[PDB]
Design a binder for this molecule. Structure first.
Ligand code: SF4
Length: 83
């Protein structure tokens, strides 16, 4: 079950970025964002994931202030975690 502040499918920014909490139900292949082959991309290996926000599988994303994403999710702003 998602936290009360999870990013949800109806959030305008989530729609614009084609976020999904489950990267296997995402369009990461179509987007072909650079840095890793697409099938390898999810929030856990994204630069915008905030490992010190949230709990468990539900972590922060700098693009979704006040909310939580799933570490197993994806959106079209995915960017390799470089530091
Ligand atoms: S920017 Fe990165 S951490 Fe945030 S939802 Fe998109 S893929 Fe996940």
């Amino acid at each position: 079950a998602a936290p009360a502040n999870a990013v949800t499918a109806d959030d305008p920014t989530a729609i614009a970025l084609k976020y999904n909490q489950d990267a296997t139900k995402s369009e990461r292949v179509a987007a072909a964002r650079p840095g890793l082959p697409p099938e390898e991309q999810h929030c856990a290996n994204c630069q915008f994931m905030q490992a010190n926000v949230g709990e468990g599988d539900w972590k922060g994303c700098q693009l979704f202030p006040g909310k939580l994403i799933n570490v197993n999710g994806w959106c079209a702003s995915w960017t390799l975690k470089a530091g």
